Amino acid sequence: MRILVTNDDGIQSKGIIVLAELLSEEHEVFVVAPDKERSATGHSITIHVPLWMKKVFISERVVAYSTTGTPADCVKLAYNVVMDKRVDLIVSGVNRGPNMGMDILHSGTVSGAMEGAMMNIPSIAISSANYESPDFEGAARFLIDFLKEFDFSLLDPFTMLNINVPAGEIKGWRFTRQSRRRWNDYFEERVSPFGEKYYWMMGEVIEDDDRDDVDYKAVREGYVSITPIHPFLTNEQCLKKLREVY
Amino acid sequence: MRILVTNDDGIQSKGIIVLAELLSEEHEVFVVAPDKERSATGHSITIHVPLWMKKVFISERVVAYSTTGTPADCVKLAYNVVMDKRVDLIVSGVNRGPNMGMDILHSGTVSGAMEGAMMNIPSIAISSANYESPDFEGAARFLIDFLKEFDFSLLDPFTMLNINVPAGEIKGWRFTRQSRRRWNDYFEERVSPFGEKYYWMMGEVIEDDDRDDVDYKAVREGYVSITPIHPFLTNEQCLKKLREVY
């Protein structure tokens, strides 16, 4: 009912606008997003300098604000300064491009929802798995239908859903685990006009997951990937063996 | 033998200098760190703009470079541009202040080591758990001794160690799990000279872990907390129940 919508691409992104519009048809939507494009922002927050907000217009039905902070800052601000600590659901995204595998850690889109999970508020990060030709309306429409069948009592404490939607035809959806999808990075070296070398990061993807129920596999098969994630990074198995040996 | 040292507080931090100096006595050390103070940077990387490096002096025994990027950028640059893809160990830190519980996700110090884990290179993030009165030499000396007794074959793939060292007397060390230590945030509102309100983030810590083997409990008891962590955020239990129901 009381939904907070945020993103990583900025308040002007079509991805966050269409999402907010559709959700506003049946819910009280507040939009608090960065006042500018963010990329590979990860889960950073702003505590060393002040934060600022400015009223923005998106719809007469939705309350929108842009801020000078990151997606996580936006969630904190929305919760404390705008919504009077009353939020039933946080949806971050309709991001242009996928957020799968280990890239989840560099994702500002996921960090926005994760901020909500850390506060223990049901949250969802949703991305259109096709940077080139995103399908913002289709991903948003999928979410609307998905919410009608999802039982939030089944989403554990401090847990959020990471959703990746195929840009084309959606065959259906699957609950998936995070993959180990990652990148083989390297840099292209170039020279400035003043003779200084600078580096451009590039890379080739690595997809070598043995398991079949991982995020990128559902997505390439035409299914929406839905992964339950939480802010706990302990490697239990390793910890167990370490204690067993020491 | 071939060690890469980085941090989040910048190449001028005493914390990274003392660490590098001590490690250089018996190993070939390379230091690649941010050219400036970072805070709550999380695991962000730079792919939208070029990266730059500048040779810096710390010791005639260590090769040091500052970069315009984040801790993770530094690791990528060090690996590809400086060390010819030959690194035996990555140590990020001797950070001023703790990196425990959920704060691990906002930590630039942890992100530096995590970048190494994602590359599957043994990595360690180490912090002095006392921002006010850090003990950089003591934390670094602890690590030197710890390395003499730690078997890296026991550190699973894509797994790193998050170390928090008490600033005072070290009673010993414990393998711990990440806690749910977190913060009850709120903002103090102020007004600019031109009449605009701005917000300062503040907060009271929440420590309500039932388990006794968590990071902050070992640290307050006087023990070094050592947590094995990896870039996998799937909540397995939740995923299992979700599949069981759907």
Give the tokens for residue A138: 């289709």
Q: Which of B105, B186, B190 sits opposite A231 (nearest CB)?
A: B105
**Interatomic CA distance for residues A200 and A188, integer angstroms:** 5
CB contact at 8 A, B69 and B48 = no
**Interatomic CA distance for residues A75 and A114, integer angstroms:** 10
In a 10 Å sphere around its CB, with 0-12 CB exposed, 13-18 middle and 19+ buried, how is residue B52 labelled? middle
Angle subtended at Cα A228 by Cα A222 and Cα A233, rounded to the nearest 5 degrees: 125
Chain B residues within an 8 Å CB radius of A155: 238
Torsion of CA A19, A169, A215, A207, to 10 degrees: -120
- In a mutational test of the B interface, the residue from A120, A238, A244 whose CB has the highest number of chain B CBs within 10 Å is A238
HEC string for chain B: CEEEEECCCCCCCHHHHHHHHHHHCCCEEEEEEECCCCCCCCCCCCCCCCECEEEEEEECCEEEEEECCCHHHHHHHHHHHHCCCCCCEEEEEEEECCCCHHHHHHCHHHHHHHHHHHCCCCEEEEEECCCCCCCHHHHHHHHHHHHCCCCHHHCCCCCEEEEEECCCCCCEEEECECCCCEEEEEEEEEECCCCCEEEEEEEEEECCCCCCCEHHHHHHCCEEEEEEECCCCECHHHHHHHHHHC
**Interatomic CA distance for residues B122 and B205, integer angstroms:** 31
**Interatomic CA distance for residues A72 and A18, integer angstroms:** 21
Alpha helices in A67-210 (DSSP H): 71-77, 108-118, 136-147
Q: Which of B178, B230, B246 sits opposite A175 (nearest CB)?
A: B246
Cβ contacts of A187 within 8 Å, gap of 6 or more: A199, A200, A201, A202, B51, B76, B77, B80, B81
CB contact at 8 A, A160 and B233 = no
- b/e string for A95-128 if b means 16 or more Cβ within 10 A? bbbbbbbbbbbbbbbbbbbbbbbbbebbbbbbbb
Sign of CA dihedral A151, A155, A157, A163: negative
**Interatomic CA distance for residues A83 and A121, integer angstroms:** 13
Contact criterion met (CB < 8 Å) for A239 and B155:
no
Chain A residues within an 8 Å CB radius of B230: 233, 235, 238
- b/e string for A11-47 if b means 16 or more Cβ within 10 A? bbbebbbbbbbbbbeebebbbbbbbeebbbbbbbbbe
Chain B residues within an 8 Å CB radius of A51: 187, 198-201
Torsion of CA B27, B32, B37, B43, to 10 degrees: -100
**Interatomic CA distance for residues A97 and A13, integer angstroms:** 13
Method for this entry: X-ray
**Interatomic CA distance for residues B186 and B205, integer angstroms:** 11
Q: Which of B42, B80, B196 sits opposite A43 (nearest CB)?
A: B42
Cβ contacts of A175 within 8 Å, gap of 6 or more: A226, A227, A228, B239, B242, B243, B246
Chain B residues within an 8 Å CB radius of A232: 178, 180, 233, 235
Give the tokens for residue B199: 């917000």
CB contact at 8 A, A38 and A15 = no
The 8-class DSSP code of residue A214 comes to B
**Interatomic CA distance for residues B24 and A231, integer angstroms:** 35
CB atoms within 10 A of CB B39: 16
Domain ranges of chain A: 2-246
Q: What is the CA radius of gyration of chain A?
A: 19
Three-class SS state of A49: coil
B2-246 classified as CATH 3.20.20.70? no
Which residue shows structure tokens 């842009």?
A66
**Interatomic CA distance for residues A233 and A229, integer angstroms:** 10
CB contact at 8 A, B124 and B160 = yes
The 8-class DSSP code of residue A149 comes to T
A130 appears as a binding residue in the annotation:
no
User: How far does B177 lie from chain A, in Å, by closest CA?
Assistant: 6
What resolution in angstrom units was achieved for this structure?
A: 2.0
Angle subtended at Cα A202 by Cα A199 and Cα A203, rounded to the nearest 5 degrees: 145
Edge to edge, the sheet with strand A223-229 lists A53-59, A62-67, A28-34, A2-6, A89-96, A123-128, A160-165, A223-229, A172-175
Pairing relation of β-strands A160-165 and A223-229?
antiparallel
Contact criterion met (CB < 8 Å) for A190 and B50:
yes
Beta strands (DSSP E) in chain A are 2-6, 28-34, 53-59, 62-67, 89-96, 123-128, 160-165, 172-175, 182-191, 197-206, 223-229
Distance from CA of residue B207 to its chain's centroid? 21
**Interatomic CA distance for residues B165 and A38, integer angstroms:** 34
Sign of CA dihedral A136, A9, A12, A3: positive
Q: Which residues of B are annotated as a binding site for Mg(2+)?
A: 8-9, 39, 95
- b/e string for A170-196 if b means 16 or more Cβ within 10 A? beebbbbbbbbbbbebbbeeeeeeeee
Beta bridge partners of A175: A226
B14-24 and B136-147 are packed helices; what angle lies between their axes, rounded to 10 degrees?
A: 30
Contact criterion met (CB < 8 Å) for A47 and B41:
no
- b/e string for A139-153 if b means 16 or more Cβ within 10 A? bbbbbeebbeebeee
Which residue shows structure tokens 């067993």?
A244
CB contact at 8 A, A62 and A20 = yes
**Interatomic CA distance for residues A88 and A111, integer angstroms:** 18
In a 10 Å sphere around its CB, with 0-12 CB exposed, 13-18 middle and 19+ buried, how is residue B12 labelled? middle
Give the tokens for residue B118: 């994602």
**Interatomic CA distance for residues A5 and A10, integer angstroms:** 11
Give the tokens for residue A142: 């999928």
How far lies B56's CA from each of A105, B1, B65, in Å? Answer: 30, 21, 5
In a 10 Å sphere around its CB, with 0-12 CB exposed, 13-18 middle and 19+ buried, how is residue B166 labelled? buried
- In a mutational test of the A interface, the residue from B238, B241, B245 whose CB has the highest number of chain A CBs within 10 Å is B238
